[PDB]
Homo-oligomer: A and B are copies of this chain.
Amino acid sequence: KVKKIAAVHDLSGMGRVSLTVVIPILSSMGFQVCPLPTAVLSNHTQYPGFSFLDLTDEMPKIIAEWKKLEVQFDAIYTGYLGSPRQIQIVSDFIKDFRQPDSLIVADPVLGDNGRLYTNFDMEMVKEMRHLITKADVITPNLTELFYLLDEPYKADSTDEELKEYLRLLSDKGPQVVIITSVPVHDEPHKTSVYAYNRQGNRYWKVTCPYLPAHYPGTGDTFTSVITGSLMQGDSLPMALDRATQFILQGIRATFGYEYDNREGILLEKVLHNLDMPIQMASYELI
């Protein structure tokens, strides 16, 4: 038996976002990914244009059959949703498919660089605020964090402010809260990730020398690796390390020739480096 993950994400043909990242990563990590597609696109929405087909009306039809099949899922991992209407459907899906040992992961995909993704609006943000209440683990980037808390984007927070924000989000329900893409004061070529585990009341941080917002889909890569790592039995900080190192390699793999960063990290090139432990701890308790 191979554990099954219901992945509630869009399918985009080009760019490395959503299902075309989730599927390869989590399959490589030993988990069967069962897609519940939210939308179909030619490519991600950080290109100038894209085709877009909303799958809101098909999703209950898929779920209906999954019930008929009596499929059990070990995890439900959500990301980019096709319409605000889908939060209700997904939230009911989690309600009806959760099990005592389910892992529920929500990447609250709303935007990056201080801005909502194309065509998203406050209806999506308000609904997503509900969706996170169903999850065990959430992975907002800094843009999403402030949309979720209904505050304005602020790039420069203290570590204590960041720990407050982590607690505020955990109070909405999730035991594990992870904030990605946090600027590093007076280090403009670095990013950091902050995490909180309610169980044991622990806070972590990792500094990593890349800028994920240059590469669409890095949140999907990050959260995919976090999901598989936790499901394999790694600790939260171990998971942070695996995810951040994997993304670092994927980003570095694009260096030294002309590259259109919109195509994403070079996933397939570095995919086999997931198959190893990180023999150097980079994480710290804060």
A residues lining the B interface (CB < 8 Å): 1-3, 11, 13-14, 16, 19-20, 23-24, 27-28, 30-37, 40-43, 47-51, 53, 55, 58, 61-62, 64-66, 68-69, 71, 176, 186, 189, 197, 199-200, 202, 207, 209, 231-238, 245, 248-249, 252-258, 266-269, 271-281, 283-286
Instruction: Please state if B233 and A27 are interface contacts (CB–CB under 8 Å).
Output: no
A48 to B253, CA, bound (A): 35
- Docked CA distance A189–B176 (Å): 19
Is there an interface contact between A233 and B269, defined as CB atoms closer than 8 Å?
A: yes
Docked pose: A283 CA to B248 CA in angstroms? 11
9 tightest CB-CB pairs across the interface, nearest first?
A42-B65, A233-B255, A24-B27, A276-B277, A51-B61, A42-B62, A273-B277, A235-B255, A23-B23
Query: How far apart sit A255 and B123, CA to CA, in the bound complex (Å)?
Result: 37
Contact A283 to B209, CB < 8 A, known contacts A11-B11, A36-B13, A66-B42: yes
| A255 contacts B232, C-beta separation under 8 Å | yes
Task: Assess the B199–A257 pair: CB atoms within 8 A.
Answer: yes
Chain B's closest residue to A260 (CB) is: B69
A14 to B13, CA, bound (A): 20
- Tell me the number of copies of this protein: 6
Which residue of A3, A27, A275 has the most chain B CB atoms within 10 A of its CB atom? A27
Residue from the list B186, B236, B248 in contact with A285, Cβ < 8 A: B186
Known: A2-B268, A27-B271, A269-B30. A255 touches B236 (CB 8 A): yes
Nearest-CB residue, chain B, relative to A48: B68
Whole-angstrom distance between the Cβ of A34 and the nearest chain B Cβ: 5
